[PDB]
Design a protein around this ligand. Structure first.
Ligand SMILES: Nc1ncnc2c1ncn2[C@@H]1O[C@H](COP(=O)(O)OP(=O)(O)OP(O)(O)=S)[C@@H](O)[C@H]1O
Ligand SMILES: Nc1ncnc2c1ncn2[C@@H]1O[C@H](COP(=O)(O)OP(=O)(O)OP(O)(O)=S)[C@@H](O)[C@H]1O
Ligand SMILES: Nc1ncnc2c1ncn2[C@@H]1O[C@H](COP(=O)(O)OP(=O)(O)OP(O)(O)=S)[C@@H](O)[C@H]1O
Ligand SMILES: Nc1ncnc2c1ncn2[C@@H]1O[C@H](COP(=O)(O)OP(=O)(O)OP(O)(O)=S)[C@@H](O)[C@H]1O
Ligand SMILES: Nc1ncnc2c1ncn2[C@@H]1O[C@H](COP(=O)(O)OP(=O)(O)O)[C@@H](O)[C@H]1O
Ligand SMILES: [Mg+2]
Ligand SMILES: [Mg+2]
Ligand SMILES: [Mg+2]
Ligand SMILES: [Mg+2]
Ligand SMILES: [Mg+2]
Lengths: 302, 310, 313, 309, 309
DNA sequence: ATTCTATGTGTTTACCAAGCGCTG
DNA sequence: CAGCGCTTGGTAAACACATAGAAT
DNA sequence: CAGCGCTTGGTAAACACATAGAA
């Protein structure tokens, strides 16, 4: 029924250790003096645990959470702040970058002092989660007390997440299988959950009841994933670059035409992970395959 | 009658073996747990069977399917999601990339958790949607935002077809239309296609027109070859313009690096037309190379044109 | 000006006419609408007249529309759902000018003959699939590279218009004179066609100017000499070159010896932006064989030497 | 909420023909013709619409006149199946723009929809399923001739009787769990103005009096003292209407008076006197509207126990 | 909430002349010429406006650019007194309609008022008292030449030194009742970016860390440990800016990169990188913006402990 | 209901630089 | 071996198109 | 004394002017 298995306690939250230290310090300090938290902002690549952390913060402060969104919302944002906002409650605006300039101009004046345009608003904390903080206007971006950045997870944390999701769903999986699924993940929790669900479907169709390590490996091979998590399309991109063009500078148009691919999807979907993993370089004369790409595909380095 | 005859079941779908070997597993697993399929994205070059596969998936699941177009639809998408969604029904959007960047933000909270953020009036309220499936087919996945592209549970790529699969498609279309055709004629039409099902159907229709005008009743191999030669297609599907491009490259410029503007002006052709209409298939077949110093004709071009290698 | 009404009156595109005749006959025999057609080529070759001729041959109606005319998808929906009957032909000139949002509304309209529209304007908005009659779309464009690949793959028949031989331009000029009441001879028409650049509209323009010159000269029949004098007055060589192209060739032959000159050096010598010399003057010179592009520079061919009355190398 | 036509209280004359029309429509497997229901306010035309829809076995689309021009297309194209029923309460309040968009959809079942929106864009004609439309207006005058011309069946809602009002009071008492005798409900219905809302309100007030009195059953007499304490006659006039008649008869001799002088005498707003109290003084034969003023009829003299003029 | 010019923290260069202008205007019993305050955002121009108003002894009317065209007329008519100060924060956001209504009120103290609400109607010229208008903006570019020409005094706000930021931190600590030493406040001010809000926020974070540690006094070592736990460098660069510099220098060799490639390498939004992290990397000499991409200067190499190019 | 203004986004265009061959 | 010429590729800066929020 | 002529007075029904509202 539910596949987005969100943890509810900060102890169930897994991977953001250096963020968790500061968050625990701030939350203990705010609870010690019976004072509401400062305004908080979360940003990072998609799928890393912004909304989950907002809900966990709401639970840990022990108050209610009022969830809204930027696309959902100028004259509207002045209503939720007073109509259904209690003292100490948290207002969570997910995807806050989409919020209008006029709507933003009616939000930060109510952030420094809890009054609008007098009407006394109760003590409240604003939590904003977005992928593009650069779209938030400087006046609104300057009244955020805490600004935090979400980092990529290590394979062990991804394995822990896979095991927890398996236990909640009711699937018997081994430590090594979860480690393999986490290793093949792209440092992202959502990718790990998706890969685990695909392996679960493969095992269920095959009739297996326990996902042993070899069963996980064969399921991932059927999915078409390397030891680095590369799909078939990424491997084909690297192979075309190495063979058809000698691995030297190519360019976006030439490489896209050779691969029967759109240049935009080659540049904004497939390339970033190869660049992160060190299998590709964006030389000013074009794209270049690194020695790691040569050795990963079983080719003699130049 | 109809010219876009689509298969209805996964058995009639012809040549996506690698994709089907996993799609069958996913559908069987979804049916076993009595749960709808996780969200799906189909992408690839035009003419390979994305919309047909979406309809086939809808038929296989047994649930209804609602068709939407990406260019058709920011706040509207909330209305379409809320008004006309039933538990298990598949929602299908073609050209999902054409959705504005503001209109996918509304799809963000309704794909991982099935609850929407809407404002009434009062204040903000949360509308809980039924457990549905969204299928999106697009040729440019790089125009879909990263969060939405991450919300998709299953992402698949449509690859090209072998000549035998194109021949099977031609035979199926012929038996559906009411035209008799030989195995070898269908194989020739498939070989002259550019690995695309739409191209194969179009070539078959042109050959049928030629044979019907000529008065022939059964399209044999010889009649098919005559019709294809009348169209002006080689054994690799090259037209006359492609042969002209290769001949001018080999003869006038010596086959070496030339460039785009020079080669286009030597042809009295627009360079954009040359690079976007004729060049990609020549590159795919191996008859042309985009070297850093210009366009170069490969040895395959020399052998195909019947010219001595340099 | 004057439009032919049948495929026999259409002057001089033989391979296209041979390909098109069988398609038209087959469509007529099967009592079915014709496949979608795309006509592309350089301007002035007769795309719109071919569309009208095809519409007359099929015996159906023709609705003419322009690419920039359709600003919004609502206009396209109104045209497709109301103005068109079963088997009618809708002609869009300069398809590549269509906006991509409106260009992508045509994929279902041409493949499935259904159109997806959102109506309701608020919380009551919902999607409808307007059914469409089995119409036919003919599209004319000069820049096929600006048409999206899914759209270009949906055209059943795609054809290219070629330049006219001087004899065909002479036949067109003679037809225009006969339909206009003039008494031009064959040699004058052939000369007017030769000075043309393989285009019909320029041939008609030149014939009309020669007619004006001859009429004010008092002659009742346009002889070859009168046509030559009128064309020289208009400023055209025996190959149709203007004065600017002629002086470009003169400068290249003299100031640089006719050898590899390069684009920048020649442009500076001629005091021209090398974005006008390359795309307005060079293409026709290369077409006529008067100029050659070399990895070292621009080379004037021997035919340019002979045409300009200069000694051979 | 009644469901079948036999559960409806007291529209016997209308129900007799409604049964025939509905049976004939069902036998042909064809949607019923468009229906218009006239009647004074307070008689329950929406309940009759619901009963008709249930009898036909078809869903509803309820909408009032002043609801939102273009929303008519939305409501017609969103949730209308084959033979669906659309009920437009207060159909004389529709705007002229919204009125000149419905009769195409009544005579031909085709609606023109604005598709481009925004600036002056084009429209498309769209086909709708065959449907029946029920209209309910209390002011037939504001219904234009073209709008009235497209309605196949036109019927009138008449005032109830003391017995049907008594049945309604019994139904309400049974729903609320209050014990009431037949004659008490008959008295309550008699003192109502042939309207269901008035009968229910009177029953609730009598219930309050009886409950305060600590009585477990409401009999005839207890209803009588409750209605006497409410200040009501055997005809339904309050103390204010009796005061109006007595002022008209005694102070002015019953002759023509005029709105301003009578209102000044009664210390009441002239509009309040004209639009709240007078309409039931008329319709009972107790008052007249002469061009020279307001006159009291002989029925007013008889009712108040005064000697005739 | 500072009140007088002596209580203001650190605009020594501006205060030295502002005191003279205020004294000269006060001695003449005449309001001072309209003043325009330039400066980067976050430096506190509204506090200086309040201080100026208090020193002149007149009332202040706070207004912003997008306040509501006719609201300017109201604020100029009703709430202006002889010598009153009208402060318009964010004055380059003022609409052109309100733009071509304020310059007659600055050069002649007369304004036209629309009297016929509704249709076009007519206007009447009205006389205003002699007042001073104080404008504040961060972007001088959007100030048109006619608007800039009518300001008698134009002055610039500049970034504070670490010592002035330390004084502000001490004032905030005293207001909040937290004991902090001289050197700790100096370190907090040094690790800020010449802005008061940054210093206050850093002080609050150090306060949270010290309170969790259960320390009654924030000394120097506690401040240094807290600011190290925040990933702050001696220049105030966070971990993300140092990572940007490291990626630019190591992965790309420091040469031109471009926004898209660098953002892809950092897994960041290009607009986020350009508008939130780059501006302080510049202005410190650690980054350059070439037409061929972004380049790391020698200061970046020296700062990160890397060998020079 | 139309007009106008803004902002955010998709698409195109104009430098600028680097590299390979010829050169004389 | 030191200009001259052509050819590719990427980076930033313009356009042009929409929506939405505005007043009239 | 029984029409004819005038003079007053009140009652209801029209106008005409505003606002507000809505797209
Ligand atoms: N520490 C964690 N433990 C368990 N699950 C986690 C954790 N962090 C993230 N997730 C999972 O990450 C998934 C998606 O991330 P969310 O927390 O829902 O929001 P988000 O990741 O910010 O969204 P996007 O699409 O990446 S912008 C959820 O299904 C969570 O279960
Ligand atoms: N596997 C298949 N079996 C049978 N017919 C097929 C198959 N794949 C494609 N076709 C036919 O090919 C034609 C075009 O295929 P589509 O799926 O409509 O195009 P597409 O894949 O959606 O690409 P576009 O233009 O980007 S939407 C239709 O007539 C289909 O019936
Ligand atoms: N004949 C009836 N039988 C049963 N319940 C009725 C009847 N008439 C009205 N009601 C009740 O009246 C309520 C609905 O209001 P109605 O009085 O039906 O509206 P209406 O008849 O249109 O009155 P007006 O004049 O239009 S406000 C419901 O509780 C019905 O049960
Ligand atoms: N120099 C200063 N001396 C004392 N308090 C100051 C000073 N600068 C700012 N403040 C405090 O800052 C608060 C007012 O906000 P400011 O920071 O002054 O707004 P601002 O000066 O306009 O900065 P920005 O860039 O416009 S957001 C009050 O609490 C003031 O006490
Ligand atoms: N084959 C032909 N026979 C006769 N006239 C022609 C022929 N081709 C072109 N023309 C004439 O030349 C002109 C070309 O313009 P038109 O065909 O309208 O647009 P385009 O510039 O796209 O060709 C027309 O006026 C037409 O009369
Ligand atoms: Mg986002
Ligand atoms: Mg598509
Ligand atoms: Mg054209
Ligand atoms: Mg009513
Ligand atoms: Mg500001």
């Amino acid at each position: 029924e539910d596949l987005a298995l969100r943890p509810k306690t900060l102890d169930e939250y897994i991977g953001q250790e250096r963020l968790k230290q500061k968050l625990r310090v701030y939350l203990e300090a705010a609870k010690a003096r019976k004072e509401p938290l400062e305004h908080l902002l979360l940003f990072g690549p998609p799928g890393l645990g912004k909304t989950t952390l907002a809900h966990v913060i709401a639970h840990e402060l022990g108050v209610n959470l009022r969830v809204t969104s930027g696309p959902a919302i100028p004259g509207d944002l002045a209503a939720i702040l007073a109509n259904s906002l209690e003292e100490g409650d948290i207002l969570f605006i997910d995807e806050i970058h989409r919020l209008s300039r006029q709507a933003e101009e009616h939000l930060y004046p109510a952030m420094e002092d809890f009054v609008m345009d007098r009407l006394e608003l109760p003590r409240f904390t604003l939590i904003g989660a977005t992928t593009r903080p650069g779209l938030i206007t400087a006046p609104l971006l300057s009244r955020f007390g805490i600004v935090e950045h979400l980092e990529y997870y290590t394979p062990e944390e991804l394995a822990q997440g896979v095991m927890r999701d398996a236990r909640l769903l009711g699937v018997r999986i081994t430590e090594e299988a979860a480690l393999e699924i986490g290793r093949r993940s792209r440092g992202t929790m959502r990718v790990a959950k998706r890969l685990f669900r695909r392996v679960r479907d493969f095992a269920q169709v095959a009739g297996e009841e326990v996902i042993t390590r070899e069963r996980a490996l064969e399921a991932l091979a059927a999915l078409g994933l390397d030891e680095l998590g590369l799909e078939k399309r990424d491997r084909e991109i690297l192979e075309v670059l190495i063979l058809r063009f000698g691995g030297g500078p190519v360019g976006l148009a030439t490489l896209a035409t050779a691969l029967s691919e759109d240049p935009g999807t080659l540049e904004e979907v497939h390339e970033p992970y190869l660049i992160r993993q060190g299998l590709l370089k964006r030389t000013p004369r074009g794209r270049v395959a690194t020695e790691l790409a040569y050795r990963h595909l079983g080719y003699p380095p130049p």
